[PDB]
Structures are given as C-alpha cells and as structure tokens.
Design a protein around this nucleic acid. Structure first.
Ligand SMILES: [Mn+2]
Ligand SMILES: [Mn+2]
Ligand SMILES: [Zn+2]
Length: 461
RNA sequence: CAGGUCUCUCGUCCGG
RNA sequence: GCCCGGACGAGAGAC
C-alpha cells in the first residue's frame, strides 16, 4: 500500500474532523499487584513519551506496492482456493437492505454504538438516529443512500489501546478507518451472504477462524491439520498489500459467483481518507475498518500462502495443505515439513514481511508445543487428551488487568480474564485468585472456581 | 458527548 | 432443571 497525496482537506471540500486526544485507559486497582510493560498508545503528536515524529510513524506502514500483476502462481492459487469455497455452496445473491442493516442468520446487525462515519460524523448524526432495531426500518437509510451514495471517504482514527514501550516511544500506534454507514450498508448487501458462509464455517475449507470459539475449536484444529506445522504473523499486513492481491481477490470472487460486485473491491484497493485536517488517497492497502476487513484479510492470506508454496516447492500438492487464518494470523500444516524461513523469503518479493506467530525474531521448527494461534498455546487435557486447552499466557492477562477504561467495569473485566486464565491450570489459576484478592476491591468480586470452569468446559462438549 | 469492520465469551436486564 | 430468542454493557482476539 502507498499514499498518493496529502493535502489540506480545505482544498478538496472536506471538513476538518478532530478526534479525541486523550486515552480512556486509567490504571486499575490491580496496577501494583501485578506487573506489566504496556501503556496506552500515543494518540497525538504532543506526547511526552514520544522519541520520534508521530505522524511519520503512524503512516510509516505504507511501504509501497511491490507488485500489481497477478503472476502465474497467484493464478493457480486463486484457482485452488476458489475451488475449495465451491463446496460451501455459498448463496451468491444480493442481501436485502433490511438484513444488510439489521442482521440475519450468520450476519449480526450493524453496531449501533459506533459512529456512522463520513458525512454523518460531521453533521452530528449517529446510527441510532437512522436505524431502529425494533422496527427494522429501512426507509430512512434508503433516503440516505439515494442522497449521499456510496464510495464515501473513510475517517482515519488512532486506536486507543495498550501498547508496548518501544511502540509508545516510536509512536507506532495503530490506525483504523471509520467506514461510512452508507458503504457498510452497500458492502453488506453485496457480500452479506459471503460473510455469513464464512461465519458459519470456521475450519480448513474456508481457511478462516472468524466465527470460532477457541474453548471448542482448539480440540478441532489438530485433527484438521496435516502432520507437520508452520506458522506466521505479518508485519503491517493491511498496508503491505499491493494491488496484485486485490485483483487476485476480485478473481476469487468472480469464480464463486460474485462477479457483478467485484467492483466494490476496487473501492477498497483505491480509497480516500480524512485524517484531522488532511485528506489523502491510498492505492493498494486494505482499509482496516471497511466492511469485510477480517474476511478479506483471511482470504488474501489463503492466496498468499498457496502462492508462496507453489513458488518455493515445485510439485507441492495444495490439496494436502491445511491452513486456518484470522486476518494475517495463520496456522498451517502439510504432510511433509516445509521451511518458514524460505517461504518468508519469497514473500518479500510480493511485498510481504513475514514472521513467527509470536512476533519472535527467528523461525523455529513448529511443534504442538510451541505453536500459537491468536496468542494462545495448545495443551491437551491430562484426564481427557483429545480435549485441548486454548492456553493464553498469564503475562497477557497480567497486562490487561492492570488497566481500566472505567472502574465500574471491574467485575466483568476481571471475571472475563478468569475465563482465559484457568486454562493455565489449577495451580496457576489459584495464584491468580490470590493476587486479585490481595486487595480490598478484589475481595468484592465474584470469581469462579477452577473446578466450576473445568466442569463447564467438559460439559460444553 | 467524540475513536472503524468483526468474531467469541462473560455479565446485566426482558422475553418464548 | 433443560432448550431457545431479544436489548444493553464488558473483556479478549485479528486488522
Ligand atoms: Mn500483523
Ligand atoms: Mn496477526
Ligand atoms: Zn484516490
């Protein structure tokens, strides 16, 4: 992905949009009980903890477009992936405006608690004004659709979230793209039946984990993988995609029956954004925040991964590839062992910076011991070895609990962390409860017992 | 009061 | 006891 032009948004007829400049993250009652290296991310240029120019750091991720032409291997990839999705029998119809708006089986309703983007954002108009869940009223949305049309610009925002130290000092904050309510509606009418199919089918046919529940899906994953594993994350995924990959995606869509609306994908591939005063244009790069972000990322991953095998391993049989993606996050297997360092080296030709799934510095051999998917480890149960724990490191849970966006959420927050931490086992779970209860507010919370969570887990099978 | 697209789960409240 | 559905809030995860 690459920035085409930044100019005062005054010159282009666009309003100045000014986001909040303050973190909503105050430190938690458990701030000193537990340790951690994470602070809220840099939101503005005037941040003391910055050791670099902010605005140059945030947009740093637009590294350019390596390729623009779907090569022969991308084409065999496209062929094989799209052949996979055929079996799903994915309904290819437009989805009616009422469902695009208020949800249907496999597709949730639009989030009435997040903004309506451009232009509503600068009119002081919100989704609640336009949408009505009780009534499922599509009338005022249609009127807005007629009036403002689609292909509206996205409003860039810095994500208010916890960041490492180097990420605060290097102003490496994450930026989302606030899709307009019009395009979310437009995109979901076009693609809603595809999003639903994906949601309903996490696994190796779709190559996607969107729609999974790790408590239950971890027990499935090993039975779905072939004998030898490899795995990756990527560096700056969305913005490291060059136009070639969008044409490859357009190509998958056409082959599965979405030919007519493949144009929308061009509006993703060439997008306009509003950022504070500026107005800028991007070519390549996934507009994270647009409808389908997750699904298109994971789909492009499946292509990227087939492509790189075909190039690196002559005669590789993609029919014995098994892979699951959640955006750039991927776990994959093949009947014979493949080399992630090599695969990652070809990936650079296509503009991809690839890594170990833990953002570790160097690729190891990947075993059912070191492999991680979505930050979690895999550990067989000791009584029931076919049932597998999603084991997230206590380090992570520690980092979270030390902060709050609002003190009145402590019960839910900590309670939620308990449902992650007990997979580390009774001995580690009870130490957790001890530390939590080491403070007076801790002794106020209703926390679940190891044994209760264990029987819940087993019962849920 | 400002900050996207989603998935999953938990919690609160209301239903069949 | 067991299903199932809705509204709202939170946490985690991907971008
Ligand atoms: Mn990444
Ligand atoms: Mn990732
Ligand atoms: Zn443009």
């Amino acid at each position: 992905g690459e920035i085409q032009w930044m100019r005062p948004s005054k010159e282009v007829g666009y309003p100045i949009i000014n986001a909040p400049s303050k973190t909503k993250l105050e430190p938690s009652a458990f701030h000193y009980v537990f340790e951690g290296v994470k602070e809220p991310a840099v939101l503005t240029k005037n941040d003391p903890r910055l050791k670099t120019d902010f605005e140059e750091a945030i947009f740093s991720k637009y590294v350019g477009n390596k390729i623009t032409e779907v090569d022969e291997y991308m084409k065999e990839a496209v062929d094989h992936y799209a052949g996979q999705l055929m079996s799903l029998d994915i309904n290819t119809e437009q989805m009616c405006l009422e469902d695009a708006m208020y949800g249907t089986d496999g597709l949730e309703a639009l989030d009435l608690s997040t903004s309506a983007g451009y232009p509503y954002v600068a009119m002081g108009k919100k989704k609640r004004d336009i949408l009505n869940k009780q009534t499922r009223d599509t009338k005022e949305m249609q009127k807005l659709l007629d009036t403002y049309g689609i292909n509206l610009p996205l409003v860039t925002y810095v994500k208010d979230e916890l960041r490492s130290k180097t990420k605060v000092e290097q102003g490496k904050s994450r930026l989302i793209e606030a899709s307009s309510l019009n395009d979310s509606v437009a995109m979901r009418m076009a693609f809603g039946n595809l999003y639903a199919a994906f949601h309903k089918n996490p696994g190796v046919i779709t190559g996607s984990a969107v729609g999974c529940d790790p408590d239950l899906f971890w027990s499935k994953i090993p039975v779905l993988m072939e004998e030898k594993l490899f795995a990756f994350d990527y560096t700056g995924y969305d913005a490291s995609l060059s136009p070639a990959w969008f044409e490859a995606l357009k190509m998958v869509l056409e082959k599965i029956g979405f030919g007519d609306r493949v144009d929308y994908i061009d509006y993703l591939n060439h997008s306009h954004h509003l950022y504070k005063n500026k107005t800028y244009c991007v070519k390549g790069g996934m507009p994270s925040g647009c409808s389908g972000t997750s699904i298109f990322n994971s789909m492009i991953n499946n292509l990227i991964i087939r492509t790189l095998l075909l190039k690196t391993y002559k005669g590789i049989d993609l029919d014995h590839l098994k892979m699951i993606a959640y955006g750039d996050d991927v776990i994959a297997s093949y009947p014979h062992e493949v080399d992630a360092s090599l695969l990652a080296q070809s990936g650079k030709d296509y503009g991809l910076t690839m890594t170990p799934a833990d953002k570790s510095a160097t690729f190891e051999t990947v075993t059912w011991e070191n492999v991680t998917f979505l930050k979690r480890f895999f550990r067989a149960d000791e009584k029931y070895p076919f049932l597998i724990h999603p084991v997230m490191p206590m380090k992570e849970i520690h980092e979270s609990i030390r902060w709050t966006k609002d003190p009145r959420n402590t019960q839910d927050h900590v309670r939620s962390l308990c449902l992650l931490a007990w997979h580390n086992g009774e001995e580690e779970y009870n130490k957790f409860l001890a530390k939590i209860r080491s403070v007076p507010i801790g002794r106020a919370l209703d926390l679940p017992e190891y044994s209760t969570l264990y029987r819940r887990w087993l019962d849920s099978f």
